[PDB]
Design a protein around this ligand. Structure first.
Ligand SMILES: *[C@@H]1O[C@H](CO)[C@@H](O[C@@H]2O[C@H](CO)[C@@H](O)[C@H](O)[C@H]2NC(C)=O)[C@H](O)[C@H]1NC(C)=O
Ligand SMILES: CC(=O)N[C@@H]1[C@@H](O)[C@H](O)[C@@H](CO)O[C@H]1O
Ligand SMILES: CC(=O)N[C@@H]1[C@@H](O)[C@H](O)[C@@H](CO)O[C@H]1O
Ligand SMILES: CC(=O)N[C@@H]1[C@@H](O)[C@H](O)[C@@H](CO)O[C@H]1O
Ligand SMILES: *[C@@H]1O[C@H](CO)[C@@H](O)[C@H](O)[C@H]1NC(C)=O
Ligand SMILES: *[C@@H]1O[C@H](CO)[C@@H](O)[C@H](O)[C@H]1NC(C)=O
Ligand SMILES: *[C@@H]1O[C@H](CO)[C@@H](O)[C@H](O)[C@H]1NC(C)=O
Lengths: 597, 147
């Protein structure tokens, strides 16, 4: 007579019928990803249509009774993650219009191509055509040429499609009772019902600002050191009180600053030593890399890896008889099948990303006892966050000595660590204010406190003050720039690649201090250390049947994000950079467009 | 008496058949009591009982009203009733089907490979024992005082 009873039976059949169909879809897509045939394409599409029609039927069955009479939250979380409908309650014309907008926005960006200055024969697509001239070159003029040629082409044509996109997505969002579709994007962080662990969708946003406000000065003590080191690089285009021109960061639209390292290397004849040639010299192989990667997880004391993983995975390209996709991916097929897809060469970087993907594999092994609806990370950012820390442990020099890949007589001093911290800080630091800025822009545009006649102004109205970047060529309302980025057009949320960073620098703070390390956090590792693996595996085994804040308190004993260990990870860089920036000015003036030059 | 019961289960469920255990199999499929009289035997059979297109031969009951009395076969597969309403054969919602199938494939992990299980439940009766053990010996000598 109750309500929880029928929900229990419905879930008990739904899990059994969902894991089977998901195995059908996953094995189809894996067999396509190994071997490119159109037969695999049409079988994969039939599998996806079967699996999507099943989810459609169960979801439209599920809404006959509300969530409100479930007091065993394991069931209510499942029916809450099930019962949303979306475009099924929307009408027949608007869904086709929306899918047409999505297909057109994806195909203009993905298959787009801009030509030279008068040649049809040598025209540049995005990857790897347009990217190399902005990736490693020195002429200011052709970098400005490409930087204008991409956006002036693509964004102006994506602009009215984006207007139709936002006006339909807002009505769709209010059709699912999340006013401001950004609130629908924040709903995955919503935690309710568990007292002392509660959350809100409105409580999130200011927390991002209240985590940004301590990151600020270090960044400028980075940024001036960047900017003054572009004095000897581009010796006309520097305002020592000013922002940065956005086609000089050694790449595309301002996300990763690695390519400046060859210019901004502090110490000349003291190299950051890569050990790829060491594996080359004393007779290695691709298999030995993943054997040692398993040997790392023995050293922390975790479960080992199944024989069915070593049987049918792919850790070597097939030469040339077949054509194979090698984008390195950790594939959980479901039903106790885990594989790793990679075209590994003898490289230290493949060693590092082998650990980075094997961390994903261990995370998939850990929660394989949950209902099928609850098998993921506890929030969206945990999975890559737990994937990252094995690379930070494996890049350590003493870890390379203990595995025979570094001669155990070798010494390490401060200039090596400063070079290493700089080549890490070009990766980690630079992504955060840009990610915050772009997510803030899209949140505001979805909020509708910025109408259509300020968009391409307000972007730069943030881009000078928060990121420290001035555009080099004037933009009007013909354009649309936030659409020159891949995750914008493909309708991907961008927030997670911020929060990931904060999460990872809690985890190395909490695990690796428990293994009783001496000295800084940047020389820390979990090796021959069982309590670290126990403290980790008590979090990885949970799943997402709990609030993510409880899963965070399981490790660190806090409920929030603290950038302060990010301070502690970057200490010697900062305390040497202060004596660097003793002969400059820090910060930026914001006037300085180089057409008021 | 000898009773040889037999079936094939998943790998991970092989611990649900013992004195005491409960769950899916012991409650709805094969009840073994907590003080039974025999031994339980199993061995892994994934190389034989599966093939690359799957194998949907082995079935199991996933729905019942109550538990089983120990050693009680049931085969009746009429449509289950969950809600409070008539069913009269017709279904779709709160009338589900109590028999599910298996999907063994030879790419799976150990926790899903089909294990073969045989149950030997044996005891005496006051009838003469039609099942003894082994005897043994060595050789036969002659012309010697022996036991
Ligand atoms: C890519 O895979 C497909 C199927 O896995 C291969 O195509 C056929 O596979 C069947 C097996 O069911 C073989 O009997 C046929 O001989 C295969 N076709 C051909 C033309 O050989 C296909 O061979 C694979 N690609 C390559 C390059 O081997
Ligand atoms: C997730 C959600 O709000 N459910 C809606 C429901 O309110 C509405 O009655 C139905 C109309 O078809 O569409 C769905
Ligand atoms: C599995 C593994 O790597 N074990 C290591 C061992 O090789 C090393 O000799 C010892 C001392 O550093 O620490 C531990
Ligand atoms: C301090 C110590 O014991 N180091 C050992 C080393 O002696 C041994 O050769 C190696 C492999 O077994 O593991 C480590
Ligand atoms: C309901 O909660 C109890 C403990 O709170 C747990 O034993 C049980 O497994 C839960 N129900 C389901 C279907 O998981
Ligand atoms: C795991 O595998 C390693 C070899 O890679 C071995 O040394 C270790 O004993 C194994 N541990 C377990 C529990 O299997
Ligand atoms: C590097 O370490 C040596 C050894 O203590 C020290 O003398 C030197 O000043 C250090 N250099 C820097 C730049 O910190």
């Amino acid at each position: 007579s109750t309500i929880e009873e029928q929900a229990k039976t419905f879930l008990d059949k739904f899990n059994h019928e969902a894991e089977d169909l998901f195995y059908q879809s996953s094995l189809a897509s894996w067999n396509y990803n190994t071997n490119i045939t159109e037969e695999n394409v049409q079988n994969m599409n039939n599998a996806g249509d079967k699996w999507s029609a099943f989810l459609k039927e169960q979801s439209t069955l599920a809404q006959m009774y509300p969530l409100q009479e479930i007091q065993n939250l394991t069931v209510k979380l499942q029916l809450q993650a099930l019962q949303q409908n979306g475009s099924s309650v929307l009408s027949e014309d608007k869904s086709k219009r929306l899918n047409t907008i999505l297909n057109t926005m994806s195909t203009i960006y993905s298959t787009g191509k801009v030509c030279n200055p008068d040649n049809p024969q040598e025209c540049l697509l995005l990857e790897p055509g347009l990217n190399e001239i902005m990736a490693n070159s020195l002429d200011y003029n052709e970098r400005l040429w490409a930087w204008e040629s991409w956006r002036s082409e693509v964004g102006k044509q994506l602009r009215p499609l984006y207007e139709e996109y936002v006006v339909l997505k807002n009505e769709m969002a209010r059709a699912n009772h999340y006013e401001d579709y950004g609130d629908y994007w924040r709903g995955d962080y919503e935690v309710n019902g568990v007292d002392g662990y509660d959350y809100s969708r409105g409580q999130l946003i200011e927390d991002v600002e209240h985590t940004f406000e301590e990151i600020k000065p270090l960044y400028e003590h980075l940024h001036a050191y960047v900017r003054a080191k572009l004095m000897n690089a581009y010796p006309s285009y520097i305002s020592p009180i000013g922002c940065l021109p956005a086609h000089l960061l050694g790449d595309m639209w301002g996300r990763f600053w690695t390519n400046l390292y060859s210019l901004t290397v502090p110490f000349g004849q003291k190299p950051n030593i890569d050990v790829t040639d060491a594996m080359v010299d004393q007779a290695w192989d691709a298999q030995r890399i993943f054997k040692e990667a398993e040997k790392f997880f023995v050293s922390v004391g975790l479960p080992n890896m199944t024989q069915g993983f070593w049987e049918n995975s792919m850790l070597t390209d097939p030469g040339n008889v077949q054509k194979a996709v090698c984008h390195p991916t950790a594939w959980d097929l479901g039903k106790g099948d885990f594989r790793i897809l990679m075209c590994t060469k003898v490289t230290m970087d493949d060693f590092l990303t082998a650990h980075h993907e094997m961390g994903h594999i261990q995370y998939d092994m850990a929660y394989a006892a949950q209902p099928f609806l609850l098998r993921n990370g506890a929030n969206e950012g945990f999975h890559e966050a737990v994937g990252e820390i094995m690379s930070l442990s494996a890049a350590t020099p003493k870890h390379l000595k203990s595995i025979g890949l570094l001669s155990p007589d070798f010494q390490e001093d401060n200039e090596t660590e400063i070079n290493f911290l700089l080549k890490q800080a070009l990766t980690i630091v630079g992504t955060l204010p840009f990610t915050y800025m772009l997510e803030k822009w899209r949140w505001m545009v979805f909020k509708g406190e910025i109408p259509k006649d300020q968009w391409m102004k307000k972007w730069w109205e943030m881009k000078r003050e928060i990121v420290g970047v001035v555009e080099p060529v004037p933009h009007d309302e013909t354009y649309c720039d936030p659409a020159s980025l891949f995750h914008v057009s493909n309708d991907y949320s961008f927030i997670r690649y911020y929060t990931r960073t904060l999460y990872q620098f809690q985890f190395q703070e909490a695990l690796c201090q428990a293994a009783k390390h001496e000295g800084p956090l940047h020389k820390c590792d979990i090796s021959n250390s069982t309590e670290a693996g126990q403290k980790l595996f008590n979090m990885l085994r949970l799943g997402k049947s709990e609030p993510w804040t409880l899963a965070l308190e399981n490790v660190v004993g806090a409920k929030n994000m603290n950038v302060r260990p990010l301070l502690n990870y970057f200490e010697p860089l900062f305390t040497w950079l202060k004596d660097q920036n003793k002969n400059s000015f820090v910060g930026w003036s914001t006037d300085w467009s180089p057409y008021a030059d | 008496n000898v009773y040889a019961d037999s079936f094939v289960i998943r790998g991970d469920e092989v611990r649900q058949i013992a004195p005491g255990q409960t769950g899916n199999i012991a409650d709805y499929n094969y009840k073994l009591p907590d003080d039974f009289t025999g031994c339980v035997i199993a061995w892994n059979s994934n190389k034989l009982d599966s093939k690359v297109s799957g194998n949907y031969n082995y079935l199991y009951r996933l729905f019942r009203k109550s538990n089983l009395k120990p050693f009680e076969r049931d085969i009746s597969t009429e449509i289950y009733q969950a809600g409070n309403k008539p069913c009269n054969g017709v279904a779709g919602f709160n009338c589900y089907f109590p028999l599910r199938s298996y999907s063994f494939r030879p790419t799976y992990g150990v926790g899903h490979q089909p294990y073969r299980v045989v149950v030997l439940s044996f005891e005496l009766l006051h009838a003469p024992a039609t099942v003894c053990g082994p005897k043994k010996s060595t050789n036969l000598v002659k012309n010697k005082c022996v036991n």
